[PDB]
């Protein structure tokens, strides 16, 4: 039984994050536990406070018409518990619930680990003989607790796109609101864990430029390559398959190439040295001693700019 | 309480995909959240627009006879919320719900990774004293969000096969509709992560043909074999057990053979060389240096054509 | 309120498999989605066709006494949806639902991977003031769809034991039926993935019999043993702990033994060679070059018969 | 509305195991699907066997006062279906349900793998204006289905402690019964899988005592040590973190020690042998050849008794 | 419909922990199953003990106004069952339920493994036309069963902070109570599992200071570093990504540094030795033999204080 409106009935939304958690890189989903704020004027409920009761009359959800506010991007239906319904003397209805859902939102892994993300939560509402429009009240969007975690992430801003986007979907109008959570990944742990160690085993790998023994140099380059494969896999596991090109995934394949050309180098040193031409053999290696780190530090600078700075 | 019909009762379906996610290669199941659209004429509820009510009279599901529309390939029973029931004036019912299910549909790993898949979602309905037929409306089946994800896939087309399939099952007739999601795998990461590194360790594998020392030659071929077993396991892990032969499983086993015959070669070289026949020893290896890459580049061409282009 | 019976009240069962999926080796559980078909005569419901209504009268679950039919081997309770109830004129009730459960059934890993299994689904019923007995109707028990999967398994036959087993449990009688889904594993992938590579690394392992250098010979056997431990663990992981001896767990342990006696061989050969007794050193090894593959191919045959052909 | 009792009302319990499964070592939880049997005298429902009805009157749960019986050590609320409520003439109600829960019970990993465990299932009941006390009926507890699995475990005895323990909890008295599932682990697969291979790589580790070469001897002890770390991690992985000392975690640490002292030994052999004092060098190694198996076989005999035999 | 009050309605809370379990470090979540204890006076229900009935009258949740008591840091809505409602004559309502929820509480990994943690459980409540205040009664907060596990943790004390925190949240007042579960990690398994083995392979690593052969000295450092990375990964995996610096993650990076400088040392020794200046080489190596354990034992002493003792 919808409130008879002369023109669109405006539903006012707002979201207050209480708990945020379990952002899945692989799944591209995170989880929210929050307050939902709906308000609309249904004037049929105005009881004129003096004549009976008190200033505000509270109703149970079964006695009132509520706009059905559905979430757009979410895996299952939202779980909700109705906290309060309060009808004003003039007939203004205030609805507040507490819901917990898991949100499904795209992530941009181009800059991983260092990347910044913006997560999305959409509220649509569908009309009947009246049109409903959801619209954001910045007073109920100011909300989240100072205590919200979202482990491994720094939380910048929770806001709402105030202008609803109005679809026509299956012979009716629906109003959509876009709430936005901006977060940035905490990259520190990755340096002592992934970055620096990978760099180390990479340096250790081409330390073989100071040695004349083939055997020691194959043990070297190959047994570092194994560990690099291990790191590659470890990082490749915790991340979804991208259609586009990642930064870390770039430098990791680069390091693959440097391992190959390293193997090529020492092999060339061997064949040349059993051809009894060490004159050239020491020359190649001594060149490598500079060329390999320079090409690296160069290409990394090349790569660095091409992603972040451009 | 079915509407008493003159001939088969026709129910008109349509699906609007809202969110897609969790396509599980191993499980051969994916997850869908969409709109379900049913419309049918149950004439027993007769209006008079002028005499009473308005153009449209809204009912709650308990007051109406609804067709029982079940999904065929789904794990557990499908979960749903009725969004709207609007009875048109003539006794035409417009039923719209929003459902979330996990669909069980076959996958083809033959061309893996590169292949296209066509996912199936089947709708049945069963009759009682009247027969029912479900049928697709291409206007309501085009459904999709321009935002639908299915991470790691390119989504081409969502459609429905217009002709209902009518089974006879346990002394009653059922009608089945086939909705199709045509998607193609996004193959990008597979090159910098799996393919190319595997090729690299394969080339590194036979880099030992330029060396005369047995020891370096066992370290090379074996420690590359290890990495190849590692990749083998890595790819074997994320994929279901195939009754047929995969492309990647083909070339991977081929690469295994090349590690094997490489091993035989270097062994034969050592025994030959301590027999003081370096005449033969340098000759065999020098043959290997060309034959091995060539057979591969051939075998891949042999293999590649044999799968995709034929 | 059960129908007053002159003698045992007979319920007629049947299952129509719709979906099969998720057979868990470790868990020894699989998952079924099917039709359940129950039928019984309640003569209290026979109003006879002519006096009112029609040939068949449909009832809602709340208005009829329904036999309470429970599944025996199942982890948690089954989820079910009542499809139809049709009472015939004479008082014959036709009950049909669709259920989804996960069944817990024993598996035999002796012949693994090559093994065949027969999965069980048991249906019971408990009595009250009348005794109930379940019995199979081969017309509804033929149940299967030509589309049923059970990915990684070949489905042979779904049938039901017509004769019920009658327990006395806690001062009342219960009737049990045994439904059987007979399946055989798809064993193909194990050859390009586990079997053949294990054999390769096993042969490559004992390639060291053609060389006199100790160092190369320790690198060989050890770095192959690593890979065999990897395969051992990988297969051991996806399989439950067996109280008995598997074929695969057998040949894998046998292969372990060959790795150990190999180590003993090269160990003896070096010490023999620095004792300046190459006479014995080349002799032992030359015996090994034939003996080792001979023992394998034999022991495999010994083992193979002892499991399969016996 | 509890039955008016002259003194404490005694509830008679019993459990009948149907399925046992999913014993999780890490979780220290298992899963049971069984029968719960309660019987109590509520005299307000009195017999008038002749006056009306029959010998036994069956009630639906909502029409009787039923005791609320809750499980103590459990994760979530227990899942249950009412099988039968049959009130005996005397006002004795016979209540029978079927439940499925996952129980949380301590495990003792002191003797792992070989250990026996006793799982606990606790039933409490809370009083109101009458006191309730539960007590076991050995007729309904005396059994389990002969088919109960608990994969990877041997089932000894299902029993119940007949004496109730009465807590005072939040100003009311509660009665607790301790049901015990006494089981012992199936330890066979661990030998062909874990034990023996570790032993082999350990023996192989110190086989280097028959060789004078340093490089081959670092290869041996180190690459056996690697595989031992692998097994260590493998076992440490499937088991929860102990506050106490395990047997396997002990001998594994001992084995770590032996790999360490092996490396120390061969290193010492090298520095001594390049100092040109082979007189001492051959002596040390020859001593190790016996002491190492002796210290080991001794330390193990010591360890074995201290756990099992004491 | 709240009890009409002259001033704030005081709710008295309390918690009795029954089970603690499944503390997840990565997740920073644990699970509790406990008693919730509420008591408040609603005077509208009046005492007429003599006039009718008895001392205490029991009500079903639907007939009384109940405070809506919500948990703050929790993932999903808590699932709960009402154990008892007994209203005392004076209008004292005694409410007791049993709930199972999963709590989300921060953990501090700075001292991991050795760390002590304090888990938080917050109870808020929201007002209507009356203001509500929750407050702790330490007699009902005394709760935990002597049986509570939290496997791998020692449970010290479960308490409640007596002063409620009173928020003003979205135009209404809410009252929050802070419950604390103080636990200390059982750090024992970590010595035989992670700590000691890592220490051993670290000593084995620089055992190469007693050897002059390049090959053996590269095999050493490399094959120890590989396993050390393996341990790094094993630990980094079971731990969430830290924004700050952990103790274990610190000493692990330090150890990485010592491996790097070790490789550097042997590398310099070889080239120095083929420069035919072993005079310098043996000096360097002999300096290392003390400096490395000394610097280590120093740096470890330095690091340890910086975390724990300050």
- Report the distance separating Cα C112 and Cα C246, nearest Å: 7
Chain C residues with CB under 8 Å of B265 CB are none
Of D196, D118, D177, D139, the residue nearest D16 (C-alpha): D139
The size of the A-E interface in CB pairs under 8 A is 126
Return the number of other C-beta atoms located less than 10 Å from residue E249's C-beta. Answer: 22
Rounded-to-integer distance, Cα B16 and Cα B148, Å: 11
**Interfacial A residues in 177-206 facing E (CB < 8 Å):** 186, 188-190, 192-193, 196-197, 200-201, 203-204
Its domain, for residue A43, covers 1-189
Output phi, psi for D149, to 5 deg. -100, -75
Instruction: State whether E169 and E267 are in the same domain.
Output: no
**What's the CA angle centered on B276, arms B273 and B281, to 5 degrees?**
40
In this structure, what CATH number is given to the domain that contains residue D98? Answer: 2.70.170.10
Q: Which of residues E135, E161, E189 is at a domain's end?
A: E189
According to DSSP, the residues that pair with E216 across neighbouring strands are none
* Radius of gyration for the alpha carbons in chain D, expressed in angstroms and rounded: 30
Which of B56, B155, B184, B204 would you mutate first to test chain A, the one with the most A CBs within 10 A? B204
Q: Tell me the two tokens of residue E145.
A: 């069963």
The residue among E177, E200, E116 whose CA lies nearest residue E150 is E116
Tokens 């992985």 belong to residue: D237
Residues D34 and D137 in one domain: yes
Strand partners, B79: B100
Q: After which residues is chain B broken (C to N over 2.5 A)?
A: none
- Picking from B153, B108, B117, B110, the residue whose alpha carbon sits closest to that of residue B248 is B110
Q: C75 and C185 share a domain?
A: yes
How distant is the Cα of B129 from the closest Cα of chain A, in angstroms?
32
CA distance A253 to chain B (A): 6
- Asked if A112 and A173 sit in the same domain, the reply is yes
* Token pair of C188 as six digits: 């193909």
Q: Which structure tokens are listed for B291?
A: 């034959």
Same domain, B43 and B103: yes
Please answer yes or no on whether D256 and E197 come within 8 Å at the CB atom. Answer: yes
Do A172 and A262 fall within a single domain? Answer: no
**How many angstroms separate the CA atoms of D137 and D11, rounded?**
10
In terms of residues, how long is chain C?
A: 310
Alpha carbon distance D50, B244 (integer Å): 73
Separation CA D70–CA D126 (nearest Å) = 9
Q: Which two tokens stand for residue C257?
A: 């033994």
Alpha carbon distances (Å) from A275 to A279, C173, D164: 11, 92, 90
Check if the beta carbon of residue E79 is closer than 8 Å to that of residue E28: no
Instruction: Collect all residues with Cβ–Cβ distance below 8 Å to D64 and sequence separation of at least 6.
Output: D42, D45, D85, D87, D93
Contact list, D68 vs chain E (CB under 8 Å):
83
Beta strands in A25-62 (DSSP E): 29-41, 57-58
**β-strands A132-136, A9-13: how paired?**
parallel
Question: Which chains sit next to E, with 3 or more Cβ pairs under 8 A?
Answer: A, D
| Interatomic CA distance for residues C54 and C306, integer angstroms | 66
Q: Whole-angstrom Cα distance, residue A121 to residue D223?
A: 53
Boundary-marking domain end, from B136, B159, B189: B189
Method: X-ray
Same domain, E199 and E177: no
Contact B72 C234 (CB under 8 A): no
Cβ atoms of residues A177 and A138 within 8 Å: no
CB neighbour list of residue D59: distance below 8 Å, 6 or more residues apart: D85, D86, D87, D93
Cα distance from D234 to chain E (closest Cα, Å)? 11
**Paired tokens of E39:** 């008591």
Window 153-182 of D: residues touching E by CB (8 A cutoff) are 169-170, 172
E216 neighbors E269 (Cβ within 8 angstroms):
no
Chain D environment of E216 (Cβ under 8 Å):
214-215, 218, 270
| CATH code at position A227 | 1.20.58.390
- Distance spanning both ends of chain D, measured CA to CA: 55
Say how far apart CA D110 and CA D119 lie, in whole Å. 15
Q: Which residue of D has its CA nearest to E153?
A: D243
Residue to substitute from B201, B235, B273, interface A, most A β-carbons within 10 A:
B201
User: Would you call A52 exposed, middle or buried from its count of C-beta atoms within 10 A (0-12, 13-18, 19+)?
Assistant: exposed
- The C-alpha of C56 sits at a distance from chain D's nearest C-alpha, in angstroms, of 30
DSSP secondary structure letter of residue B213: -
Q: Is B59 on the interface with A (CB under 8 A)?
A: no
**The CA-based dihedral angle spanning residues C269, C270, C272, C276, taken in that order and rounded to the nearest 10 degrees:** 130
User: Which of C263, C268, C276 has the most D C-beta neighbours within 10 Å, making it the best mutation to test the interface with D?
Assistant: C263
User: What letters, b where the CB count within 10 A reaches 16 and e where it falls short, cover C209-218?
Assistant: bbbbbbbbbb
Closest Cβ–Cβ partner in A242, A243, A256 for B197 = A256
Pick among A77, A123, A255 to test the B interface (most B CBs inside 10 A):
A77
Count how many domains chain A has.
2
Query: Looking at chain B from residue 2 to 41, which residues have their Cβ under 8 Å from any Cβ of chain C?
Result: 27-29
Distance spanning both ends of chain E, measured CA to CA = 55
For residue E229, the chain A residues in CB contact (below 8 A) are: 197, 201, 227, 230-231
Query: Do C129 and D33 lie within an 8 Å CB cutoff?
Result: no
Instruction: Output DSSP code: residue A74.
Output: B
Q: Say which residues have a Cβ less than 8 Å from residue C264's Cβ, sequence separation at least 6.
A: D207
The answer, yes or no, to whether the previous bond of B113 is cis (omega within 30 of 0) is yes
**Strand order, beta sheet including B173-185:** B69-71, B116-126, B173-185, B153-168
Shared domain for A47 and A114, answered yes or no, is: yes
Q: Which residues of chain E lie closer than 8 angstroms to A216, CB-CB?
A: 214-215, 218
**Which residues have a Cβ under 8 Å from the Cβ of A281 and sit 6 or more positions away?**
A269, A272, A273
| Residue C108, number of CB atoms within 10 A of its CB | 13
CB–CB of C181/C20 below 8 Å?
yes
Contacts of C193 (CB under 8 A, 6+ apart): B232, B236, B249
d(CA A122, CA D240): 42
CA distance A280 to chain B (A): 16
Say which residue the tokens 């809750």 belong to.
D70
| Bridge pairing between strands B29-41 and B79-87 | unpaired
Smallest CA-to-CA distance from E71 within E144, E132, E14, E121 is with: E121
- The CA distance from C192 to the nearest CA of chain B, in Å, is 6
* Rounded CA separation E116/E95 (Å): 34
**With contact defined as beta carbons under 8 Å apart, do C270 and C214 qualify?**
yes
Asked if E126 lies within 8 A of A83 by C-beta distance, the reply is: yes
Residue owning tokens 């053999």? A281
Rounded distance, CA C110 to CA C108, Å? Answer: 6
Pairing between β-strand C153-160 and β-strand C173-185 as defined by DSSP bridges: antiparallel
**A211-224: b or e for each residue (b if 16 or more CB lie within 10 Å)?**
bbbbbbbbbbbbbb
Give which of E241, E109, E107, E125 is closest to E181, Cα–Cα: E107
Half-sphere exposure of E256 (CA within 13 A, CB side): 25
Q: Are C33 and C102 in contact (CB under 8 A)?
A: no
Among C152, C203, C210, whose Cβ lies nearest the Cβ of B271?
Answer: C210
Cβ contact C230:C275 at 8 Å: no
Cβ burial, residue D138 (10 Å; 0-12/13-18/19+): exposed
CA distance A143 to E170: 8
β-bridge pairing C165-168 and C173-185: antiparallel
Q: Cβ(D266)–Cβ(E211) under 8 Å?
A: no
- How far apart CA A268 and CA A272 sit, in angstroms, is 6
- Kindly state whether residues C211 and C170 are assigned to the same domain: no
Which tokens belong to C252?
Answer: 């894998």
Q: Does residue C113 have a cis bond before it (omega within 30 degrees)?
A: yes
- Both tokens of B232, joined, read 């083998």
Nearest residue to C244 (alpha-carbon basis) of C105, C107, C104, C109:
C109
Interatomic CA distance for residues E16 and D167, integer angstroms: 14
Sign of the dihedral defined by the CA atoms of residues E249, E253, E259, E262, in that order: negative
The DSSP line for chain D is: -PPP-SSPEEEEE-EEEEEEEEEETTTTEEEEEEEEEEEEE-TTS---TTTSS-S-EE--GGGS----EEESSBSSPPEEEEEEEEE-TTSEEEEEEEEEEEEE-----TTTTS-EEEEEEEEEEE-SSS-EEEEE-HHHHS-B-TT---TTEEEEEEEE-SSPEEEE-SSSEEEEEEEEEEEEE--STHIIIIIHHHHHHHHHHHGGGG---HHHHHHHHHHHHHHHHHHHHHHHHSSPPPSS--SHHHHHHHHHHHHHHHHHHHHHHHHHHTTT-HHHHHHHHHHHHHHHHHHHHHHHHHHHIIIII-
d(CA C238, CA C27): 10
Task: Enumerate residues 269 to 308 of chain E having a beta carbon within 8 A of any beta carbon in chain A.
Answer: 270-271, 274
Q: Do E310 and E282 reside in the same domain of the chain?
A: yes
Which residues are within 8 A (CB) of D239 and not within 5 positions of it... i.e. 6 or more apart? D25, D26, D109, D112, D246
Residue A130 in tokens: 């009246």
Cβ of C189 within 8 Å of Cβ of B242? The answer is: yes
| D64 phi and psi angles, rounded to 5 deg | -125, 155
Whether the Cβ atoms of residue D245 and residue E247 lie closer than 8 Å to each other: no
What residues of chain B, 97 to 116, have a C-beta less than 8 Å from chain C? 104, 106
Residue B109 CB-half CA count within 13 A: 22
Residues 223-262 of C with CB under 8 A from B: 223-224, 226-227, 230, 234
Facing E215 at nearest CB: one of A19, A213, A224: A213
Helix (H) or strand (E) holding B176: strand B173-185
Contact C236 D56 (CB under 8 A): no
Give one DSSP letter per residue of B14-29, joined into a string.
Answer: -EEEEEEEEEETTTTE
Residues of A in Cβ contact (< 8 Å) with E259: 200
- Residues 6 or more apart in contact with residue E5 via CB below 8 angstroms: E130
Q: Could you report how far apart the first and last alpha carbons of chain A are, in Å?
A: 56
Residue B177 and residue B197 share a domain: no
Selected for mutation to probe chain E from A21, A192, A195, A232 (highest E CB count within 10 Å) is A192
D273/D280 Cα distance (integer angstroms): 9
Put simply, the answer to whether E240 touches A151 (Cβ < 8 Å) is: yes
Contact A149 E1 (CB under 8 A): no
Contact D33 C74 (CB under 8 A): yes
Residue finishing a domain among D189, D211, D229:
D189
In sign, the C-alpha dihedral spanning A158, A161, A164, A169 is: negative
Contacts 24+ apart (CB under 8 A), A155-160: A155/A20, A155/A181, A155/A182, A155/A183, A156/A116, A156/A182, A156/A183, A156/A184, A157/A181, A157/A182, A158/A15, A158/A17, A158/A182, A160/A13, A160/A14, A160/A15, A160/A136
Instruction: Say if residue A88 is exposed, middle or buried (CB neighbours under 10 Å; 0-12, 13-18, 19+).
Output: middle
Residues of D in Cβ contact (< 8 Å) with E149: 28, 104, 106
Whether C215 and D211 lie within 8 Å, measured CB to CB: no
Q: In terms of Cα–Cα distance, which of B255, B282, B254, B252 is closest to B269?
A: B282
CA B217 from centre of chain:
43
In Å, what resolution does this model reach? Answer: 3.8
**Structure token pair of residue E223:** 């094959």
Q: Which residue has the tokens 């639908």?
A: B148
Report residue E267 as tokens: 């590398």
Task: Check: CB of residue A125 under 8 Å from CB of residue A135.
Answer: no
- Secondary structure, 3-state, chain E: CCCCCCCCEEEEECEEEEEEEEEECCCCEEEEEEEEEEEEECCCCCCCCCCCCCCCEECCCCCCCCCCEEECCECCCCEEEEEEEEECCCCEEEEEEEEEEEEECCCCCCCCCCCEEEEEEEEEEECCCCCEEEEECCCCCCEECCCCCCCCEEEEEEEEEEEEEEEECCCCEEEEEEEEEEEEECCCCHHHHHHHHHHHHHHHHHHHHHCCCHHHHHHHHHHHHHHHHHHHHHHHHCCCCCCCCCHHHHHHHHHHHHHHHHHHHHHHHHHHHHCCCHHHHHHHHHHHHHHHHHHHHHHHHHHHHHHHHC
E41 and E12 housed in the same domain? yes
Nearest to B253 by CA among C114, C188, C227, C191: C191
Q: Which DSSP string do the residues of A279-307 spell out, in sequence order?
A: HHHHHHHHHHHHHHHHHHHHHHHHHHIII
């Amino acid at each position: 039984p919808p409130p008879i409106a002369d023109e669109p009935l405006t539903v006012n939304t707002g979201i207050y994050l209480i708990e945020c958690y379990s952002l899945d890189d692989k799944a591209e989903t995170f989880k929210v536990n929050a307050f939902l704020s709906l308000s609309w004027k249904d004037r049929r409920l105005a009881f004129d406070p003096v004549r009976s009761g008190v200033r505000v009359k509270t109703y149970e959800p079964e006695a009132i018409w509520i706009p059905e506010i559905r979430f757009v991007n979410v895996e299952n239906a939202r779980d909700a518990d109705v906290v309060d319904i309060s009808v004003s003397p003039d007939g203004t209805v205030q609805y507040l619930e507490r819901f917990s859902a898991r949100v499904l939102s795209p992530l941009d892994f181009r800059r991983y680990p260092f990347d910044s993300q913006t997560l999305h939560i959409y509220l649509i509402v569908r009309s009947v003989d009246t049109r409903n429009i959801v619209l954001a009240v910045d007073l109920e969007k100011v909300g989240k607790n100072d205590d919200v975690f979202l482990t491994g992430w720094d939380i910048e801003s929770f806001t709402a796109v105030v202008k609803p986007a109005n679809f026509a979907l299956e012979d009716r109008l629906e109003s959509k609101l876009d709430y936005q959570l901006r977060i940035s990944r905490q990259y520190f742990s990755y340096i002592p864990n992934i970055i620096l160690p990978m760099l180390f085993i990479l340096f250790i790998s081409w330390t073989a430029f100071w040695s004349t023994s083939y055997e020691a140099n194959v043990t070297l380059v190959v047994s570092t390559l194994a560990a690099h494969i291990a790191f590659n896999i470890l990082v490749e596991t915790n991340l979804p398959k991208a259609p586009y090109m990642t930064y870390t995934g770039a430098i990791i394949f680069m390091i693959y190439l440097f391992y190959f050309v390293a193997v090529i180098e020492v092999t060339v040193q061997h064949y040349l040295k059993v051809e009894s031409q060490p004159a050239r053999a020491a020359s190649i290696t001594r060149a490598s001693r500079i060329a390999f780190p320079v090409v690296f530090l160069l290409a990394n600078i090349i790569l660095a700019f091409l992603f972040f700075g451009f």
